[PDB]
UniProtKB/Swiss-Prot annotation:
Listed GO MF terms: ligand-gated channel activity; long-chain fatty acid transporting porin activity
Organism: Escherichia coli (strain K12)
Primary localization class, coarse: membrane
Name used for this protein in its record: Long-chain fatty acid transport protein
Database matches in InterPro entries: OMPP1/FadL/TodX
Quaternary structure annotation from Swiss-Prot or TrEMBL: Has been isolated from outer membrane preparation as a homodimer.
Protein family: Belongs to the OmpP1/FadL family.
Induction field: By long-chain fatty acids. Expression of fadL is under the control of the FadR repressor.
UniProtKB keywords: Cell outer membrane, Lipid transport, Membrane, Signal, Transmembrane, Transmembrane beta strand, Transport
Location in or out of the cell: Cell outer membrane
Membrane topology value: Multi-pass membrane protein
């Protein structure tokens, strides 16, 4: 939740990402737990993508009387994944992957009446991971990984109906009868709803590490603990606002006006650390259950704040997230040599306290329902197909001069192809 993504594989999608630190039926899980490397005795490849089709809607009425209805404010997304794992020795192995652990997109029409808190909010990240692992004995394995994260981000906000609202208050006040107030009201009326009042964009790399432990009770039952470090992205990018500079320094609740001029802006984005415990139990030749609890330190994300080369605040939005958990439970039906089926459910606690909710990050507690299948063409190759349905609760949002309600759900569809090489690294 809150911009965190779980879509590292399509088999995982069909499980509702349950017990992902503890299952190693394909190469995708190494990205989640590097210790799982020790479960692979030949070079193994997996690649695919998950298509996310959100349906997130906003409703309400502005004090101007304009509707705050906004349908489908969360664009579709295509999240790819690629994974490779290989033994080095009977005791060591390595793996690498390309995945995305964080990403968000919320995009309103630029004439939206609530544009000052709407507009566009986009974050895309690509996690490049290189991992290694060591098997201590039949029971214990340990893994460590290095992550290089590339992030591209953009925020835009627009005037919306603020100009109309301000003109209305001026004209209803004693100032409405003065030359000064009338001049200000004309200026306020002149601010078109699609006037850009903030633009931030930048691209940057950050770095992190991750680690895992695997405990195998036997070949059919294992448990895992993993940690993914925080990743700090220190963007240096562009900031501008098309409002006249004369708007500045009155304490108005709008971003810094720059008369359309671009200047360098700095913003630090913290991608939060995450812990996860997982279990996998193959209770029968044809059946396994798998389950997990994850804890994400979303308290590490406190605000979006862009500052200038003089250290002044250009744009600032308080977020105040809280640490949050995700719990998931799934089962896998190993039907025959070709067919495997799976299903799962999960609950994702929103890291956003009610008072801190915003329409640009329209988040809510989410429930997952998942189903999937894998067809193995032979001992070396297979395809995974997965589908998930996510449903969140409708919530009230109070932001700036506006009151909104938000509702959200999503469909997710994923396909992966898997290939294992006829190749061993024994000594
Ligand atoms: C004119 C385009 C940019 C807007 C200039 C600054 C706008 C900041 O003011 C906040 C707008 O809020 C509207 C004020 O509503 C009238 C006051 O009474 C309503 C409070 O309940
Ligand atoms: O009290 C707030 C007064 O702020 C006035 C904003 O100034 C208007 C700026 O627009 C003038 C464009 O040249
Ligand atoms: C926080 C919005 C800025 C507009 C408030 C301006 C302050 C007006 O009050 C002046 C009262 O002095 C008499
Ligand atoms: C002025 C330019 C400052 C540098 C560019 C910054 C670009 O915008 C960053 C927008 O990032 C949006 C993040 O979305 C919030 C969800 O992710 C939070 C996880 O920590
Ligand atoms: C307009 C909303 C988009 C509707 C997508 C629904 C797709 C449901 O089909 C899933 C079938 O898989 C069965 C599990
Ligand atoms: C992409 C390759 C496979 C396509 C999967 C898409 C979903 C279609 O499969 C639905 C489930 O079909 C069940 C198969 O029935 C079991 C096979 O029966 C043979 C046993 O003798
Ligand atoms: C409840 C919604 C919050 C909106 C208003 C809350 C109280 C703020 O009103 C302060 C009044 O200050 C008046 C200044 O208005 C801006 C005029 O400048 C725009 C001229 O272009
Ligand atoms: C290609 C590298 C980056 C991966 C693409 C991600 C682009 C940003 O979009 C993130 C996808 O998430 C969209 C919303 O997620 C579903 C939550 O909304 C549904 C409400 O239940
Ligand atoms: C569908 C298969 C394509 C998967 C793409 C792998 C990752 C590409 C990186 C962008
Ligand atoms: C616990 C770390 C295990 C050592 C990993 C050795 C392989 C690393 C390859 C890069
Ligand atoms: C809501 C009106 C705000 C702009 C008017 C400025 C003039 C204030 C004069 C007070 C005497
Ligand atoms: C804030 C915790 C510091 C990281 C320690 C994690 C140890 C790796 C466990 C798997
Ligand atoms: C925040 C101080 C409020 C004082 C009101 C002065 C408004 C003057 C606006 C400039 C146009 C003359
Ligand atoms: Ca080799």
């Amino acid at each position: 939740a809150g911009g965190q993504l779980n879509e590292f594989s399509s088999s995982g999608l069909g499980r509702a990402y349950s017990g992902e630190g503890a299952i190693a039926d394909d190469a995708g899980n190494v990205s989640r737990n590097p210790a799982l490397i020790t479960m692979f005795d030949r070079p193994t490849f997996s690649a695919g993508a998950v298509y996310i089709d959100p349906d997130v809607n906003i409703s309400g009425t502005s004090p101007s009387g304009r509707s705050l209805k906004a349908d489908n404010i969360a664009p579709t997304a295509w999240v790819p994944n690629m994974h490779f794992v290989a033994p080095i020795n009977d005791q060591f192995g390595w793996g690498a992957s390309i995945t995305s652990n964080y990403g968000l997109a919320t995009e309103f029409n630029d004439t939206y009446a609530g544009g000052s808190v709407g507009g566009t909010t986009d974050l895309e990240t690509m996690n490049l991971n290189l991992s290694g692992a060591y098997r201590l004995n039949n029971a214990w394995s340990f893994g460590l990984g290095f992550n290089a994260v590339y992030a591209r981000a953009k925020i835009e906000r627009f005037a919306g109906d603020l100009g109309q609202l301000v003109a209305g208050q001026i004209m209803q006040s004693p100032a409405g009868q003065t030359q000064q107030g009338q001049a200000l009201a004309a200026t306020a009326n002149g601010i078109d709803s699609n006037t850009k009042i903030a633009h931030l964009n930048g691209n940057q790399w950050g770095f992190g590490w991750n680690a895992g432990i695997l405990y195998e009770l036997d070949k059919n039952n294992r448990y895992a603990l993993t940690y993914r470090s925080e990743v700090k992205i220190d963007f240096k990018g562009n900031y501008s606002s098309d409002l006249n500079r004369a708007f500045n320094n009155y304490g108005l609740p709008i971003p810094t006006a720059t008369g359309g001029a671009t200047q360098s802006g700095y913003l630090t984005l913290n991608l939060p650390e995450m812990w996860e415990v997982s279990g996998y139990n193959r209770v029968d030749p044809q059946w396994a259950i798998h389950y997990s609890l994850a804890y994400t330190s979303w308290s590490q994300f406190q605000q979006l704040k862009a500052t200038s080369t003089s250290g002044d605040t250009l744009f600032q939005k308080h977020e105040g997230f809280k640490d949050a958990y995700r719990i998931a439970l799934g089962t896998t039906y190993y039907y025959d040599d070709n067919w495997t089926f799976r299903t799962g459910i999960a609950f994702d606690d929103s890291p956003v306290p009610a008072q801190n909710r915003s329409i640009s990050i329209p988040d809510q507690d989410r429930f997952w329902l998942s189903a999937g299948t894998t067809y193995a063409f032979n001992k070396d190759a297979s395809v995974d197909v997965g589908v998930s349905y996510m449903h969140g609760q409708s919530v009230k949002i109070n932001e700036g001069p506006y009151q909104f309600e938000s509702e959200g759900k999503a469909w997710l569809f994923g396909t992966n192809f898997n290939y294992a090489f006829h190749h061993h690294h024994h000594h």
